[PDB]
Amino acid sequence: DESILLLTFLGFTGLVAKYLAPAYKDFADARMKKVSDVLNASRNKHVEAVKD
């Protein structure tokens, strides 16, 4: 009986890995990119001050 439920669960995880998982990879990447760019920007900024 409960193996029918497990078949449903297998399908559920399949749809999740299809649609959501590449989106969530991209989402995580996007935030990471933004953080890194700000972080490195700050490094550039203090280098300018030394030169000034």
Binding site: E2, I4, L5, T8, F12, L15, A28, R31, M32, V35
Partner: protein, 224 residues
């Protein structure tokens, strides 16, 4: 001892892993997994600064965070098709709700004296119906006691039972001959759709717990 004890331990171990095995020794750059637990932090920062904002909100921020994560994790774990009644042991969830409700009521009485009962005077309204509005304010105030638990309990329990009964029906479509196993898959697709809805509404219900018990705490800390 019990099965219940074994899954409570499992919840603890999942939660440990999100602040241990998800970061790369705390890089400032951030890890893909660790970005998830940043966003959770941010939306409960911005939710509970929004709800129980005042001169404090961070003093009750851990409490609301461990209420977030517990329900957030336990409506994925309880939705594995071979996982035992934790939250679907309603007595634990409803008990947790009543504990928090009493811990608000006591907090309000202690912090705000017997003028805590001014919380159950709701507004300046015509004086001959001021006492009436105390009676049916207290009635609704300890309706807050059972509502918070009963929301979560009903949602999670009903989802698992719905799926299992329909699973049993599609079992019997496919237990008789192949022409019934044809169009035995059409209801099966409905169970898959229901499972998608049930995962969604468990995360929605998790937000609803933590906003409602922020709303109640807003009321309890800030009188009226």
């Amino acid at each position: 001892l019990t099965t219940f004890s074994l899954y409570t331990i499992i919840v603890l171990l999942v939660i440990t892993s999100l602040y241990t095995l998800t970061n790369n020794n705390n890089k400032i750059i951030g890890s893909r997994w660790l970005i998830s637990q940043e966003a959770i932090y941010d939306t409960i920062m911005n939710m509970t600064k929004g709800q129980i904002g005042g001169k404090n909100w961070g003093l009750y921020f851990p409490m609301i965070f461990t209420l977030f994560m517990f329900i957030f994790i336990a409506n994925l774990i309880s939705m594995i098709p071979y996982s035992f009644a934790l939250s679907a042991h309603l007595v634990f969830i409803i008990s947790l709700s009543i504990v928090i409700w009493l811990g608000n009521t006591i907090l309000g009485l202690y912090k705000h004296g017997w003028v805590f009962f001014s919380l159950f005077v709701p507004a300046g309204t015509p004086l001959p119906l001021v006492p009436l509005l105390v009676i049916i304010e207290t009635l609704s105030y300890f309706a807050r006691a059972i509502s918070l638990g009963l929301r979560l309990g009903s949602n999670i329990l009903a989802g698992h039972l719905l799926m299992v009964i329909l699973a049993g029906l599609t079992f019997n479509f496919m237990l008789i001959n192949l022409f019934t196993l044809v169009f035995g898959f059409v209801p099966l697709a409905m169970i898959l759709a229901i499972m998608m809805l049930e995962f969604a509404i468990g995360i929605i219900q998790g937000y609803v717990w933590a906003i409602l018990t922020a709303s109640y705490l807003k009321d309890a800390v800030y009188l009226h």
